Design a protein around this nucleic acid. Structure first.
Ligand SMILES: [Mg+2]
Ligand SMILES: [Zn+2]
Lengths: 50, 101, 51, 79, 139, 152, 50, 50, 161, 98, 51
DNA sequence: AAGAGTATGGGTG
């Protein structure tokens, strides 16, 4: 439900998820790159206590 | 006698590429893209040339587009732009919506 | 305590510094408060009249 | 551990072997995703590994046994 | 590079005495070394300290209580190990207090120990009178 | 180097201006880890501005991380020793009074060099082999080397 | 203003600093006398006599 | 202390010794003066005899 | 005064070791310097590294060549188990400057000796360096065969054979 | 003066010297002897390769430190290759084996 | 190399060795070392600033 | 015809 949840997930996990092909993963990477973000980031203490 | 090493634009770009969570394929694509950048900051070849230089047929053009979009947000903002309009739009996309005009 | 007179170890500052081993030795105190003594020429022979 | 490592040296019996075992356990905790066997109190992985070693819970043989058991479990799950 | 070469050789340590002044007592020369022979009581043939014992403070106190005179100890010169030495011919690690471990660069330690005090050395330039009462020996 | 009379034997006093430069990639990683910076350039700019949170990050990253202090000439292995840093104001390094004899150092103009171990093996070697709390006896003769002197 | 360690004098044998300190104390005392005489306006004769 | 009890008590003992020594050296008020260097009264007689 | 060479030749290794140790300690005690006797002994052991063969025996050594003592003792203990006769020898005493020039590594020798002479002699002889010492591994940026690296060199050695 | 990273010499690929050049401190022979006497082999190797003139090792170490993985991948110093080339330029065949 | 990933991976390899050999160099060995022969003493063009 | 002594050159600091 949040960008912080999405960016912590790796490409392999998204690829293994059902109903998600390579095209949709490429689109997700493109829209994240449009804002200077990427998949595979690590965060401490998430969710952000809310 | 010996001089000292100097950091160029491509050295800074590769330093930023090194510390970015890319995959191996994405890292090779980024290496080719940074190789295809001149000293004014513009891309000198079409993405077809980069795709051909990668050397495998399992990669499509949209992956190259995504890697290029990720790279274009490096420092300085607007680097590796296709043309002037692309550079101006990339620079504008980093501005807040409260800008008057 | 009875009004008599006794002899005890001195509380002199230089003597306390030397006796405790904090700084200084006997030769340096001799130079400070007694004659410096005989010196030597650059070759090494002693000068007959000391300081 | 935080000041002196004498107890860990007595446990292992050698300072060089102690350094090697502590480095192995610290790398297991830092990157391998393992959880500490002692209550961590704002401590780095090196100090946690030293405290585990001085408590008698970690040595070379225990690490080897754990590694072999994990490999056996992985190969059983693969089948 | 080894724990024990199995040798039985060694050197004889006695107090260093010049004239009537004792320059070096025995305990300062055998502390932290390993005996190469059984230590026998001066008056009898009973064994005081067994073979291959690391002489720490307690053993030195025992030696000086029974008035031991000379002790044979193991040394790195008479060591059978080739390409290195063994732990028992070297003895105690002075900086740690226990016996030396394997893998120690003792040559660098020895060179540094000898060379460090070298800055305190200056480079540029008829009757025997006894003092105490005791038996007299002629050799 | 100046004297720190309040320090413990395993501690040294490090200026935070030096420590900010010495531990820069650690600070970058820590900034990226807790969401303060999303990219490397954001963390780099944040450290360049020297914001108020980078000091908390620096205090968190140096908590248990030994550093090596060395004084020249190095005549024996006691010329390099490991210490736990304490961040201080100013520009001078504070040294424990009981180690100076091992360094042959005095506070009338002497300078010292500081090195940072990087890998886990180096940090554990610094803690287990080179810490001043392990170098109590002399490797030359077996006598203590942290004996008090002068004022004490 | 300054605190100096007395332990540095005896081994160095530089006794001139102690004598300089005593003489500076005496000079400052003379200056203090003159300053006190000047603060409360007194005759020129007393100043020149002192 | 090191030979009887071990390493850690020796470190604690050394720190406590340093603290106490500094505190009581400060409290003593030890100083150095010109009158501390006492000259023997027989020096000139010995020099004259020599 | 008596030369140490004659003391070694007539009285043996222990006597010359005692002589050198006592002389060095006498020089150091005048200044009140405390040094343990171990270190001088290891320096002396490094000095007494060579040996001169006095009889070839059943070995292939020459009549009067000077070689490493460890090689001679290894060969003699190998032959003695086969029922053969080992070769007699005599220990030699050298200075540290000459002892350090007899190392079997041209990289280590060229590090601190005259580089031109060492390189020329090694090139003429066609030598081969095994990288066994501390300085050799320091030059090429490897773990030293001491301390925490010691075990690392052992496993490698048992992965080669 | 302090330094994390900076510029290097063109030939030796080692950090420069001096505060004006934003250089690093020299780790000389006596410091190496001290580290050998301690037995700290990993500290010495880290000082010898990934901090001075292991060109790929520097980048890998920096990336690992940023990623929070304190581990090095040592390589061959560049000064040794320079020495090999200089010795070969004298007409002497020196090479690495196996 | 065709595959760019393998090409980039192949230029960051560490050579494996366990010994160092030294000997004399024949003219054939020196010719096998080289990539070409130097025939002129010039270094830089100084007009196009090219070698 | 060998063998001991002197002069010269190389290396180190
Ligand atoms: Mg000074
Ligand atoms: Zn032995």
């Amino acid at each position: 439900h949040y960008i912080g949840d999405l960016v912590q997930r790796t490409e392999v996990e998204l690829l293994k998820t059902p109903n998600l092909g390579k095209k949709s993963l490429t689109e997700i990477k493109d829209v994240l790159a449009s804002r200077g973000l990427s998949l595979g980031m690590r965060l401490e203490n998430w969710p952000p206590a809310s | 006698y010996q001089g000292e090493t100097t950091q160029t634009l491509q050295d800074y770009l590769m330093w930023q590429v090194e510390l970015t969570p890319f995959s191996d394929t994405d890292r090779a694509i980024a290496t080719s893209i940074v190789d295809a950048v001149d000293e004014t900051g513009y891309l000198t070849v079409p993405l077809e040339d980069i795709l051909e230089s990668i050397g495998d047929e399992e990669i499509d053009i949209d992956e190259v587009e995504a890697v290029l979009k990720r790279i274009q947000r490096f420092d300085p903002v607007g680097v590796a732009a296709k043309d002037l309009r692309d550079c101006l739009l990339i620079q504008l996309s980093q501005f807040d919506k409260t800008t008057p005009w | 305590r009875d009004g008599q007179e006794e002899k005890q170890v001195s509380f002199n500052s230089i003597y306390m510094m030397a006796d405790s081993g904090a700084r200084g030795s006997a030769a340096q105190i001799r130079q400070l408060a007694g004659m410096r003594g005989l010196m030597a020429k650059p070759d090494g022979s002693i000068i007959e009249t000391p300081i | 551990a935080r000041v002196t490592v004498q107890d860990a040296v007595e446990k292992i019996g050698n300072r060089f072997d102690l350094v090697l075992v502590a480095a192995r356990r610290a790398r297991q905790m830092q990157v391998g995703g393992k959880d500490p066997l002692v209550p961590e109190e704002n401590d780095k992985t090196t100090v946690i590994a030293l405290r585990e070693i001085e408590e008698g819970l970690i040595n070379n043989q225990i690490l080897d046994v754990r590694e072999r058991q994990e490999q056996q479990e992985q190969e059983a799950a693969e089948l | 590079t080894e724990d024990d070469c199995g040798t039985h050789e060694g050197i004889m340590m006695t107090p260093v005495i010049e004239g009537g002044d004792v320059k070096e007592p025995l305990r300062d020369r055998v502390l932290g070394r390993v005996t190469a022979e059984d230590v026998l009581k001066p008056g009898t043939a009973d064994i005081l300290v067994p073979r291959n014992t690391l002489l720490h403070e307690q053993w030195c106190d025992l030696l000086e209580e029974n008035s031991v005179d000379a002790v044979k100890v193991r040394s790195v010169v008479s060591c059978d190990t080739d390409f290195g030495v063994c732990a028992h011919c070297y003895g105690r690690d002075l900086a740690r207090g226990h016996i030396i471990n394997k893998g120690e660069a003792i040559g660098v330690i020895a060179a540094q120990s000898i060379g460090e005090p070298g800055t305190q050395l200056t480079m540029r330039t008829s009757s025997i009178q006894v003092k105490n009462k005791g038996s007299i020996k002629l050799s | 180097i100046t004297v720190g009379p309040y320090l413990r034997l395993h501690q040294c006093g490090l200026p935070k201006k030096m420590a900010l430069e010495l531990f820069k990639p650690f600070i970058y990683g820590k900034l990226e880890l807790r969401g303060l910076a999303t990219t490397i350039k954001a963390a780099k700019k944040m450290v360049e501005r020297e914001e108020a949170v980078v000091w908390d990050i620096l205090d968190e990253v140096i908590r248990e991380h030994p550093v090596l202090l060395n004084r020249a000439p190095t005549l024996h292995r006691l010329g390099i020793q490991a210490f736990e840093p304490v961040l201080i104001e100013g520009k001078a390094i504070q040294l424990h009074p009981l180690v100076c004899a091992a360094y042959n150092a005095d506070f009338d103009g002497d300078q010292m060099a500081v090195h940072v171990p990087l890998t886990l093996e180096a940090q554990l070697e610094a803690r287990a082999l080179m810490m001043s709390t392990n170098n109590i006896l002399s490797p030359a003769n077996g006598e203590p080397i942290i004996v008090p002197s002068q004022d004490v | 203003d300054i605190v100096l360690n007395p332990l540095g004098v005896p081994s160095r044998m530089n006794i001139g600093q102690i004598l300089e300190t005593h003489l500076g104390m005496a000079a400052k005392g003379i200056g203090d006398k003159i300053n006190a005489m000047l603060k409360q306006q007194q005759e020129v004769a007393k100043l020149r006599e002192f | 202390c090191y030979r009887i009890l071990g390493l850690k008590p020796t470190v604690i003992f050394a720190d406590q010794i340093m603290y106490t020594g500094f505190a009581y050296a400060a409290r003593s008020g030890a100083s150095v003066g010109i009158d501390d260097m006492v000259i023997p009264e027989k020096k000139h007689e010995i020099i004259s005899e020599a | 005064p008596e030369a140490p060479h004659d003391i070694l030749r007539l009285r043996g290794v222990h006597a010359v070791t005692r002589y050198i140790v006592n002389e060095v300690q006498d020089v150091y005690r005048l200044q009140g310097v405390k040094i343990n006797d171990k270190h001088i002994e290891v320096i002396v052991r490094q000095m007494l590294r060579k040996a001169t063969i006095v009889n070839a025996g059943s070995s292939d050594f020459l009549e009067g060549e000077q070689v490493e003592y460890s090689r001679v003792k290894i060969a003699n203990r190998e032959l003695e188990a086969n029922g053969k006769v080992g070769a007699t020898y005599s220990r030699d005493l050298l200075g540290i400057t000459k002892a350090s020039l007899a190392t079997e590594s041209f990289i280590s020798a060229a590090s601190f000796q005259e580089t031109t002479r060492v390189l020329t002699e090694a090139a003429v002889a066609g030598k081969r360096d095994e990288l066994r010492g501390l300085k050799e591994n320091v030059i090429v940026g490897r773990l030293i065969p001491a301390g925490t690296g010691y075990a690392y060199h052992q496993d490698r050695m048992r992965r080669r054979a | 003066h302090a330094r994390s990273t900076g510029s290097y010499s063109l030939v030796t690929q080692q950090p420069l010297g001096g505060k004006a050049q934003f250089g690093g401190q020299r780790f000389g022979e006596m410091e190496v002897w001290a580290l050998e006497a301690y037995g700290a082999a990993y500290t010495l190797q880290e000082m010898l390769t990934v901090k001075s003139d292991d060109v790929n090792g520097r980048t890998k170490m920096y990336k690992n430190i940023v990623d929070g993985n304190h581990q090095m991948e040592p390589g061959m110093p560049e000064s040794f290759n320079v020495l090999l080339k200089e010795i070969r330029s004298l007409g002497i065949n020196i090479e690495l084996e196996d | 190399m065709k595959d760019l990933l393998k090409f980039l991976k192949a230029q960051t390899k560490t050579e494996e060795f366990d010994a160092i050999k030294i000997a004399l160099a024949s003219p054939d060995m020196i010719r096998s070392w080289s990539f070409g022969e130097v025939k002129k003493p010039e270094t830089i063009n100084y007009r196009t600033f090219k070698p």
